[PDB]
């Protein structure tokens, strides 16, 4: 009950009992909170409540110290001091932004802006509070009791009346009952059980709510610049494949942390693995939020690094399949590949944090808390997709508010920019270069003459709120008959429900833009589906079209994004 004040450090006994995290506030700061917010409960060893029997006055502004004990105006003895005077609340050892963070519901963009423009200790407060609020929100949805099982990938669900029915995408992971995590896709619903088990009739699912631990470490450790490469030993024989990245690899060694902005297909994983071959003694921990991000860094490591010094760390609560070709759960290997959530407490010469646009400030903190490293390298692209903010429903979260790393990349610029896309036909590179990279992204590849756009608004139907455009799928079906090379194309849309319909009618493999991020396919068919803020998001659009190595067909709903596409237009 005796801690440091989460604004100005000053020691105190005073926590806010009305904040859901119960931060230590100093007397000067605890006042400025309780006199400007609905927050009136102050905690110490014993709470600031009237000590008089059967009295329910808990508001610190209405209370006094009568000797050793606390009382209201109705109960205080004659010789009694008010708890709230001279800009202080009586405690031992005797903020606008803090107030907004403490009282916001996290449904407004402006909440996330503030949680990223504030001081560093407030960003940790912001991050615990948000994650806490995100988790206490999960409780608010209804249970799904199984009515009838049909097959091994279809069942019928009965939903708890009174409480809302949560969105049934790959984003919302359920816990069955204890029969391992489960997911759902659209009364013909598809059940994807992480642990295989013949789905019991009467068994029920609930959204996994995990206790939010406190944050000690900053999002970003303070920035150190060195005159010499510190604690790392470069090779002089450095394989020509990685010669582009030498001057950036020497930057990495002459700073505490470095930011790398790599637009799609610019050699981010090449750089991350190229760092181990340049500092070949250095112990490196490769981390990202998702199993797919970590498994891609593993694929690159298998090609260029010795397999006996590589370990893939897997949490005992195995939620998906992931990389098998390394030794599993050897914490002590030179090369450690691990999702942020499963990190051990370790030291490292270098930590590489990949897919940084998907990182929350919570994630940035946990990494500084689990990994103690000479150098931190932050790899991703603020022009790509952020982690979904399930509470945010009002306003759009701009890239500079994604996390502290993206804020740095969008303000002072990144330390290192991979400026040549080697994946995408020039038509795609030229479009996204103008759209999100201020014309600084260059095409290696020639124009493919296999990049098509069609403006076709079609008809928008909705499965709950997820959008479908059958006519846009119909246009694709027509195109495929005349373009058999596209038979092998991945179908991409901003909506699962669209993808579900496109699966049945086209037979193509299916990916949402968000789940496509980090992957590449020869041919891509993209139906925008709707003209919403979701489907017009320039970051989502950027990712959607940069998945393609050879060709893309974009059926567009939005005039602006249609006109910007530097593609041959089709008719019909
Ligand atoms: C062509 C072979 C050697 N691999 C290779 N060289 C790269 C250089 C920069 C970015 C990505 C790269 N991938
Ligand atoms: C330095 C001593 C006290 N042990 C220690 N504490 C750690 C915390 C995070 C990562 C690695 C750590 N190793
Ligand atoms: Zn409070
Ligand atoms: Zn203080
Ligand atoms: Zn009283």
Curated annotation (Swiss-Prot):
Interacts with nsp8 to form the replication-transcription complex (RTC): nsp12, nsp7, two subunits of nsp8, and up to two subunits of nsp13. Interacts with host TBK1; this interaction inhibits TBK1 phosphorylation and decreases by 75% IRF3 phosphorylation, which leads to reduced IFN-beta production. Coiled coil: none annotated. A ribonucleoside 5'-triphosphate binds at residues 262-269. Residues 237-418 form the (+)RNA virus helicase ATP-binding domain. The chain holds residues 5325 to 5916 of 7096 of the full protein. Residues 1-105 form the CV ZBD domain. LRR repeats lie at residues 208-228. Zn(2+) 12 binds at residues 16, 19, 33, 39. Changing residue 88 to H: In strain: Iota/B.1.526. This is Helicase nsp13. It catalyses: ATP + H2O = ADP + phosphate + H(+). It is found in: Host endoplasmic reticulum-Golgi intermediate compartment. It comes from the Viruses. Plays a role in viral RNA synthesis. Multi-functional protein with a zinc-binding domain in N-terminus displaying RNA and DNA duplex-unwinding activities with 5' to 3' polarity. Activity of helicase is dependent on magnesium. Binds to host TBK1 and inhibits TBK1 phosphorylation; the interaction with TBK1 decreases IRF3 phosphorylation, which leads to reduced IFN-beta production. Changing residue 409 to I: In strain: Kappa/B.1.617.1. Changing residue 321 to D: In strain: Gamma/P.1. Zn(2+) 13 binds at residues 50, 55, 72, 75. Residues 419-572 form the (+)RNA virus helicase C-terminal domain. Changing residue 372 to C: In strain: Omicron/BA.2, Omicron/BA.2.12.1, Omicron/BA.2.75, Omicron/BA.4, Omicron/BA.5, Omicron/BQ.1.1, Omicron/XBB.1.5, Omicron/EG.5.1. Zn(2+) 11 binds at residues 5, 8, 26, 29.
